[PDB]
Amino acid sequence: AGEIGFIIKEGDEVADVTIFAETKDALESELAKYIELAKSVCAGVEYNVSELTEESKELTARFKFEVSAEKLIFELKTRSLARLEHHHHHH
């Protein structure tokens, strides 16, 4: 990996989710639920997001936690959350 144009990069307690959808609005709606899950695991979570525009049909938001355990927990929980693909034009 090289140097990328992000604030927070990869880490030991940093986990990013990459969401795809027609609109940023849809991405934000889902992302907000990830942020919601994040605050449920770690209120002191710090997160960044890719450049948000009208043409961002994809975004990468990384939540860094206090310990690497919280990362794993978030990854474990998102497994049961990010199943049942929901891109079906209804979303």
The whole-angstrom separation of Cα 62 and Cα 9 is 8
Count: domains in the chain:
1
A 10 A CB-CB count for 64 gives 22
Cβ–Cβ under 8 Å, residues 46 and 6 = no
Cβ–Cβ under 8 Å, residues 63 and 34 = yes
Closest of 91, 87, 84, 40 to residue 63, by C-alpha:
40
Residue 19: give the domain boundaries: 1-91
Q: Which residue has the tokens 């049942």?
A: 84
The CA angle 26-83-87, to the nearest 5 degrees, is 35
Q: What are phi and psi of 46, to 5 degrees?
A: -115, 135
88 CB-near residues (< 8 Å, 6+ apart): none
The whole-angstrom separation of Cα 85 and Cα 91 is 10
Q: Which residue has the tokens 């604030």?
A: 7
CATH of the domain at 74: 3.30.70.860
Method: NMR
